[PDB]
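Q: For a teaching session next week I want to show students how multiple molecules come together into a single three-dimensional assembly. I've collected the sequence lines for a complex. Could you give me the predicted structure tokens for the whole thing so I can convert them for display?
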Amino acid sequence: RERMGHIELASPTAHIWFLKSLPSRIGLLLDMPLRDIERVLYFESYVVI
Amino acid sequence: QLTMRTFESSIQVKNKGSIKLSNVKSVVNSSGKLVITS
Amino acid sequence: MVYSYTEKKRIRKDFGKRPQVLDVPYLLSIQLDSFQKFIEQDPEGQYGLEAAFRSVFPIQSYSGNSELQYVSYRLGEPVFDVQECQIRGVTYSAPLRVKLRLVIYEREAPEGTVKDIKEQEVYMGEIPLMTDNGTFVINGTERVIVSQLHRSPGVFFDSDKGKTHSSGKVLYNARIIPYRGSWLDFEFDPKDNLFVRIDRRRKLPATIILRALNYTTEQILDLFFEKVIFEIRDNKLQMELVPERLRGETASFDIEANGKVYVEKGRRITARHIRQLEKDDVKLIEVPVEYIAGKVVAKDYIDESTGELICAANMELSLDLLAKLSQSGHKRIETLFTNDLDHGPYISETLRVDPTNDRLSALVEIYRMMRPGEPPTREAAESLFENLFFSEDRYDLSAVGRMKFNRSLLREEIEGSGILSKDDIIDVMKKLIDIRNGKGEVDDIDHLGNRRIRSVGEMAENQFRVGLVRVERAVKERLSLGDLDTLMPQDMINAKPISAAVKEFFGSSQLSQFMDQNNPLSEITHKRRISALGPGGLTRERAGFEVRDVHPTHYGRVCPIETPEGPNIGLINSLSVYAQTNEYGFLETPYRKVTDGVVTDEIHYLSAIEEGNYVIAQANSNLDEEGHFVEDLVTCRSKGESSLFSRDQVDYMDVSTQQVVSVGASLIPFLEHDDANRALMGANMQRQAVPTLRADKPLVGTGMERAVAVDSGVTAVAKRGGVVQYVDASRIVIKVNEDEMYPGEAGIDIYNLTKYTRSNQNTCINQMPCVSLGEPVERGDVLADGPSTDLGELALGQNMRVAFMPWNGYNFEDSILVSERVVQEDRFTTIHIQELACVSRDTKLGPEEITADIPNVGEAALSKLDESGIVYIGAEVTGGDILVGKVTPKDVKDSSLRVPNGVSGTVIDVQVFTRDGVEKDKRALEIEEMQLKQAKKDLSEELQILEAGLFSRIRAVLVAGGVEAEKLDKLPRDRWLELGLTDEEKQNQLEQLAEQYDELKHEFEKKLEAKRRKITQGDDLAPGVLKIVKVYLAVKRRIQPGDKMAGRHGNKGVISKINPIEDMPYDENGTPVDIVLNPLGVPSRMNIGQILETHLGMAAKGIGDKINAMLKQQQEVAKLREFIQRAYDLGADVRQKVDLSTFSDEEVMRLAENLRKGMPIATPVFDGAKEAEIKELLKLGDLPTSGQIRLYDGRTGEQFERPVTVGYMYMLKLNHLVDDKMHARSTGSYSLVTQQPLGGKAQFGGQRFGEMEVWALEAYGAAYTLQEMLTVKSDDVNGRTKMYKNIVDGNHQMEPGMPESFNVLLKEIRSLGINIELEDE
Amino acid sequence: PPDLRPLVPLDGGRFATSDLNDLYRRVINRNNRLKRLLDLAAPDIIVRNEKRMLQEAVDALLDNGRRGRAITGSNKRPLKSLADMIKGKQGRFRQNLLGKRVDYSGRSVITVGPYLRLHQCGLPKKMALELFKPFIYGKLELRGLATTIKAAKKMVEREEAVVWDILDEVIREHPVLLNRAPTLHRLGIQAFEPVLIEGKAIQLHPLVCAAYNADFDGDQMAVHVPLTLEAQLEARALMMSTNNILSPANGEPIIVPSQDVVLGLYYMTRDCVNAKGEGMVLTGPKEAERLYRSGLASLHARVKVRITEYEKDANGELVAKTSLKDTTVGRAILWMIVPKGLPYSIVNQALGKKAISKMLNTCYRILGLKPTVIFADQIMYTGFAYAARSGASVGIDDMVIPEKKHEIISEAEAEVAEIQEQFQSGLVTAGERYNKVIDIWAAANDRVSKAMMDNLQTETVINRDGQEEKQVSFNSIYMMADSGARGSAAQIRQLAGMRGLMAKPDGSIIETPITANFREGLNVLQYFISTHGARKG
RNA sequence: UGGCGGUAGCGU
DNA sequence: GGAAGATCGAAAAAAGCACGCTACCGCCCGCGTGGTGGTG
DNA sequence: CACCACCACGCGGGCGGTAGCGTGCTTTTTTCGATCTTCC
Ligand SMILES: [Mg+2]
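A: Of course. Below is the structure for the complete assembly, covering every listed component.
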């Protein structure tokens, strides 16, 4: 009832709670509109680093 | 006990007593009647 | 009129005064007619399977080489009977066989030449069949598919009464709802611009659809606006003067013509000037140039010299633009006639807002709105636009939909196409524009003429059509695989989609509800129920207030009182008594045509829409028997409103006083003396009464009990007239008359009554005969009485001697005091049957078996069990006793079925179902052999009748030929056939008769063999189970405190005390009353119909008492005849007439012995007995007219200070028993996740301490109590164990510990990317 | 952890759905596929698609349907994600933390207990035995009738004779909390002392029903058993019914007679003018009670009796004063249950509902709490007994209909005909004529109600020793309306007079009212019109 | 040895 | 004297929709491929 | 003995289709393109 497990993700995935729950935490932190955020997360546009 | 469904040119005095006025400024007209400019 | 055989046994006195002109129709006709329309063969493809096949077939392959077409369909006979389906648990259905033609054309010549034509018959699933009672047998269970009240397809205009824009402006909108397709909406924005939406998506300007319809701007302006020609004269740019264009405007320009100054500048226009210009017929008017600047051009104007456009269409004009147009030589200019209140410029403003300017742009925009993200292509956009509304495969405006569409648009044509067109959309938008302008009105959404009723047949046809189009797609895919020359049509199609859709509709639908088998009234009400909560309809939460209201159009179609009390109030309604359905699905009600004042007898069925035009009179209107109203001012209703009208202005007459109410409401006597709310409660609780072990007729009724009893299939009704050849407690054999004889038939009808079979509500269904040997019967006469039925009359409750008085607070608020004689006489005792199933399946290790012995149990446990491991029939059992002994290998573990705790009763039936191949035990062999014996007995009786006839013929032939009757009578019967006479035609006919006898015997033994094979055919089960054993336990529930009892007027209550017989109040004669009721309920709950009924009941009982006395003194038949005739003749202008002089002096005695328990009284729901009639009946019975007698206290013996109301009332025992509600738990099982106690009574579980109780505890100083509720009793396992141990040892101390639910929540939150912990510091 | 998402067996060879397990399986599948693709040195498009699908699966597991379409399971509905088991009404917070199912609880229908005291409630024997099982085990082991607790259950479920005595011992002073399903306010749950009864229904004191908002027509109540010393202490001291006398919302009393006590007290405290035994002088209330029981004097006889009343002085004790008062036999009988401190003016009246409430309030203010509880119990007992003795009943002749009502109705018809003729003449518009019709119909209804009330209240014209006298009527309907036991002026007026104007659902008033009483026969139109308001309400 | 969904009903 | 700031109206998205209880049924992959066992 | 029939089964996911599906509630927050404004 108390022992937990874990899965090692092959690639990082964004947390939906910190992305889609308005106001978006990731978008507010990065000062970028949410549309760019989830068009970059889901492999539709490139973002410069 | 509540409900939800959505369904004067003069002042009448019923008791006996004096009349007081609050935050009033007025002026006496030609006939002497008081008209309030507030 | 001569009474029927069952009616002559007990004639009910009728106090109705207005003669009836239309008999009550069949109650269950709405379901049966719809199903017949669904299944009956139709030469024209309009309804049912034929219509669906014609809509889908023919089927064309991908290439024009092969095709499949439908010819005819035939429904085969069901394999199992309805009773057999119910017993075996299989679905009552019939096979569907369809004739299909596969046509293979010529590959070389595809112009139409054919190569092969193949005919075949193929099976494509089983269609469930509706029984004679309008119900379905799905998986062995009775189901009812209720009708759905939905929105009729068509175009509907409405608006919001200032709900939006915060300014109070009305935004008109119009919706085109099809039967199958997409929804098109046209809305008005706050800025007075028309917009169009498809399927409630993002709006677009309303000119986009017009542009996509190959309409240019000039055509749109011509269609939606009036044209004014600004013809360029020598000067002043005169127009054509149309006076209708000068209504209510500002005349800023000087109106002069023919040298007369009609209107000067700055003068407004009223009716006088309009009259003046109309009379002057002015056509040419001088106009200022600036007046042109305020207009809008209509069509494009181009320059001929330069080949360029001077002006486009639909923009505001300007001085420079008009100067350029004038200098270009265009002496003719066109403009729009626009008014600020009469003809608004909505279309022009929408076009200006509209960005598109061509058909292709509009199509691309429509495609982008419909499918965002996809690349807009010309072909894709064109295909989508064509398939949206102009394709029969995607859009279907039904025949009723087309009729409503044309009616809303004022069109004389009804037989239109099922798809939309340019004209339809243009007319709809024009009507919306006119409504916005002011000419026109919005439609009533809740109007019953705008609401359709869909029955079981329509929904079944729709589901079959869905399955059929799925099968059509599959067969279209399959047909293009080549090599069609060696393939029959049988393998082309697949029955999986059709069968799956049919099963889903009939078993897993919101309207295929479990049949309510509490009583015949419950079944009748359920079958005649209309629910707006089905698919494609309303929802219980977002229903609203307006829809639940009682619309005026509900008069005569929907019962205003019979509706559930709760969340689904108004959404579920009951059909009226005389209400029926149109061919389009609209409800209609009967009326009597009134011509020239006199009321005729011809019946016209008027719908909701057409009833508004006529003025409909009232049933409660006095007539002089000549058809003329005695009063000039008759109360009528013209258009949803009541008013007084002249006697010569009436158009129609109400057909009956029961037209408004439903059957449940019409079953309530003295309804007009009860409040509407109380009537609603009484109607709702009338169908919750469980049947008692003895049916008691209502002393006071309404006369509708016979119809309810007969129409419901709970009673056995003779199919053909004749005499009762053999009556028995379980079967009836009727020898039919020679008139109703069939050729080649013995002529005997066998009715096997159902005895003690559990209902859907775990009640008892039992039929008892009401006929004797040699008693003649006729068609329609009842032979057996079903549950809650007495002599063919509905009997839901019992007649009870009640007294209205307070009794020491034992009837304080609503409680009921019940005498011990009620329990002693078992008046309200009921029988409840519960079914328990033991399932022997196949496991991975091995198959479990039903066996006698059980590991680790004593010998006394198996005493009830037989050698086969099944409990003996008739063996009394209690909680925890073994019913079916079953073990499962692990050597084996216990899995035997046991009686649930707190459940007792007697085993009355055991049914064993065995899968094919699995061996049958001794009990199964016994059950099948009893069934075989019963079938053999029936067929044997048939054989004896037929062979007796044949042997009588043989004896007649022999006595005609050899006249050896003396020798024949002394010889065995077979020797008559074995003997041979002299050689003539007599020998030939003897041989023919012997051959006929032999072939008849062969046919009957073949029938017996077929019946035996059907009995032991072997039913299949679920995959994995090899045996099922069902055990039925019957228990008797007696009345006890806490049980809910109610009358027919909503006076519900709970039994508070079973008073001793000697303690109950008694009258002068010493007879105690049975029920004591609180008078305090009457003044608040305004239901006077109680007291009146009580009074009437007393009178009825008094009459019976007198008759009983006349029977106890062995008086002559003349006195009984005279007294009963006097009793029946009592009244004032009563339609019922009873003549006892034609009763043959023997039926009078039977009638008297039937009435000795109280003469029944029929009180029509709105034409009942007045107070004077009740007082006269009381005087006939030698009872006080006031209805109040002097009572004495049972205990002290002192007379009560005031007379009390003592009478007889019909009491009903509702299906809310205290033993089914009482529950208590100290410690039991807990949930495996939250570690909390389970919920419910079937499983041992505790009550829920909800949030509101926690708030209540917090409002107190309850802190330790709250912690105790939260932790030590629910979640903390260690706390629970410690508390239990401490109480066991005698210490009342607690350890709150840590609730497990919080730990579960913490783990659940930690499962996300969020860390949460309980810090210590 | 797996135990929080268990795979329960279906007892048929298969298992449950476990949407969490399905989402985890999908996530694992996506992760493994992505790992295999990375190990294979995949081109950009394939790894991009796999990563996007894995991200979508992770989002669905964390919050199904948050961004895109929800993953559909085998039931053709969205699967339950991790966020779905935390939020909402069905989430953990509102279903297993703020409220939960509790042991030592039961539920049963309610029944009036007239013999019960204010602090007592009737509990079924079987329910009490089930609820108090551990206490019975403990008492049995303490007294030594069993050797092991298994033997304790074996004596319990077989229902031995001593088990009833043990159960009676363990419930002697163990309060039980009774709660109704809608717990609207604090008084929705109250503590009572259990009294073992035969049956399956819980017996409830009538006087607490108003606190519970409970009526005896099928309502059910839940009983909880405190099982710690602290909880019993707060049940006795905080949640006890005797403690709750005033509503916390406004301070008004919550225990008032409602239906039969009021009627009984009203009938007892009433006077005729020629009743049996009128005019005699009695030595005290006991003599009046003896005369009433012996039948020598009527309950309404106006007599003169000697009574002693105790008044509270400044020092706080009671000083007695004996005097002869002109009263009735019933009032003298009722005086015997009034405590000493209260004066005699409380019972020397008709004693309606308001009078009883005022008398109880004065008793509470002057005497205290325990005397107030005793007085309330005695008032309820006496009211029930004398309501039973009165034998009041409702009959069809009680609702007397005056002919002046018919004359007024005919005059109203004449006036409405005149108004309609004036409208036909064109001198009055539709709105004003409709308003005038409504006004005249309201006036006619008021006149009918006034005439009916005047007939009802003083119909009794009875003869005194010499001549006639018009006194207050004894009509049962009128007594019920006047005493306040049940009904008001409007309901009695609907019963006997015209039902008045009725409103169609949109809110407007129909021109023609219901001019038929409930005693008389409403036609189809009147019933159909009334159904509009009934359905609206 | 549980969950989900639908249906109907009871008390408010 | 034309692009940031402010406004702003419409479109979309998210959150909520009383409590307690009773009874019933329907369902709790999939599918359609391939490995492997039976076979003419 | 390589060919058909039975059960593992594997990854697969929205399904079935030569496309859409959706259609009777109210309140709050975001946001996003369009519009007017004003000064650097
Ligand atoms: Mg109640």
